[PDB]
Amino acid sequence: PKAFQLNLATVKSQFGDLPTYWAIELIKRYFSAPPAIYIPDVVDNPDFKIMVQQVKFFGNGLRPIYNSKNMITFTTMLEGASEATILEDMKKQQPALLSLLPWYDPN
Amino acid sequence: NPIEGGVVQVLPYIAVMKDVYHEVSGVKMDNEEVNMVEAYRDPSILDDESIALIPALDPAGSNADFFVDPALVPPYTIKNEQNLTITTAPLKANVRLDLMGNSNANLLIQRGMLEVSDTIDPAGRLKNLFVLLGGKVVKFKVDRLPRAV
Amino acid sequence: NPIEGGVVQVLPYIAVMKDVYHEVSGVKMDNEEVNMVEAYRDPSILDDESIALIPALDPAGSNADFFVDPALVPPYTIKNEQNLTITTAPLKANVRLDLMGNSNANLLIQRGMLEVSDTIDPAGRLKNLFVLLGGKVVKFKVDRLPRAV
């Protein structure tokens, strides 16, 4: 299949009302991204895209994240991956990934 | 010496640059590297306030109750060494807050959430005092007074 | 001895392993563990190309202008220690680029983005030249020539 955009604004709205950089960290946690990943704020770089590509498999090593000029392509094995389905899976996994207590309380 | 037949002038210098990652489709390393000598003419080259503890206003309003009502003092924008913006307002008088917890450091978590190992420098001052004068606010710069330490 | 009534043979050895992490599904740790002794007969099990700096194409075409037109030299893929592959092609002549920026280390970020601490080994060579001749391309292997150093 083809990579699709994961709109950062929709992540903020799904988990209450996160500040930009907490939503970015939540995405990095969901995709187990290395801590040496740079992702700008949308206001600072409105052209920057966070993409998600559904891949056939992961390797036995670290998650194979791909990097373009002005967009980062996160990799998932989710069947039928789309913006909505990633957002729903993030909400399922969020309790283990990052504590959003000041904004989002799943309890 | 006629054996040497020439010279090489070696100029060892120190260069200052930013913590910049390599670009994928970059024609060059887009890292503003200059010789430190330029910092004498342009003080911003070595100007580093990255460690400042700036109480930051949550865009969501989650901690808005700790800050001066925008009706009196509208929040303003600060750009840090990364050219990114935070919304900053003065703290409300008679406030009890986690000073680190509400700092820009916990909204700008590119480096990480604050933990027990993060401490405040005992060396500090009262920077500004905001007084309501006859219905409008006057900003008093008090960072040079002996009582502000 | 009839008291012992048996024998146990203990086989210590040093094993060659692959650098892998546990999977969430967790059926088993699929690490290609092999006895070091085999390396005396097929030493290729020790090969490690992860240090190599191989220019890589952005699947989006963001850095395609640094590489030879696919109409002349079609790109080819290479595989790492896993089954993940990336696309590489010879660099176009008469270009200026960030050589590390366009390297495989940034295109496939498993171990983080390249930083100022990542440097190029001066002990490099010119490996190949691709010459256009009569509408088609001839590959010259020049890695061993003293002018390629």
Single-letter amino acid code for the residue at C144: R
d(CA C92, CA C141): 16
DSSP β-bridge partners for residue B139 = B130
Q: Between C66, C96, C113, which is nearest B22 by CB?
A: C113
CA distance C55 to C33: 30
Beta strands in chain B (DSSP E): 15-16, 34-35, 76-79, 85-88, 128-133, 136-141
Query: Positive or negative CA dihedral for A57, A49, A67, A38?
Result: negative
Contact status of B7 with chain C (Cβ, < 8 Å): no
- Tell me the three state secondary structure of residue C55: strand
CA–CA separation, C8 and C95 (whole Å): 67
Contacts of A67 in chain C (CB under 8 A): 106-109, 113
Q: How far is B68 from chain C (nearest CA, A)?
A: 41
Cβ B34 vs Cβ B16: under 8 Å: yes
CA–CA gap between residue C18 and residue C48 (Å, rounded): 10
Q: Which of A58, A66, A70 sits opposite C108 (nearest CB)?
A: A66
**What is the b/e burial string over A38-72, where b = at least 16 CB atoms within 10 angstroms of the residue's CB?**
ebbbbeeeeebbbbbbbbeebbbbbbbbbbbbebb
- CA closest to A31 among chain C residues: C110
Structure tokens at C73: 């030299």
Rounded to an integer, what distance in angstroms lies between the CA atom of residue B37 and that of residue B33?
Answer: 12
Going from the C-alpha of C40 to that of each of A84, B18, B115, C18, C46, the distances in angstroms are 54, 48, 51, 18, 10
**What letter represents residue B119's amino acid?**
T
Chain C positions in Cβ-Cβ contact with residue A59 (cut-off 8 Å)? 80, 82-84
Tell whether B30 is within 8 A of chain A (Cβ): no
CB C108 within 8 A of CB C77: no
Q: Which residues contact C93 (CB under 8 A, 6 or more apart)?
A: none
Three-state DSSP string of A22-42: HHHHHHHHHCCCCCCCCCCCC
Query: How far is Cα A44 from Cα C25, in angstroms, rounded to an integer?
Result: 38
Check if the beta carbon of residue B86 is closer than 8 Å to that of residue B108. yes
Judging contacts by C-beta atoms under 8 Å, the chain A residues touching residue C80 are 59
Crossing angle for the helix pair A83-97 and A20-30, to the nearest 10 degrees: 90
Q: Do C115 and B21 touch (CB under 8 A)?
A: yes
A contact chains, 3+ CB pairs < 8 A = B, C
DSSP letter at B27 equals S
Q: Which chain C residue has its CA at the smallest distance from B20's CA?
A: C115
Annotated resolution, angstroms: 3.5
Between positions 41 and 80 of A, the ones with CB within 8 A of C are 57-71, 73
Q: Which residue of chain B has the CA closest to A18?
A: B60
- Tally: H helices and E strands in chain A: 3, 4
Q: Is-contact B125 B148, C-beta < 8 A? A: yes
Pairing between strand B15-16 and B76-79? unpaired
Residues in chain B: 149
Strand, coil or helix: B129: strand
d(C-alpha A29, C-alpha C78), whole Å = 29
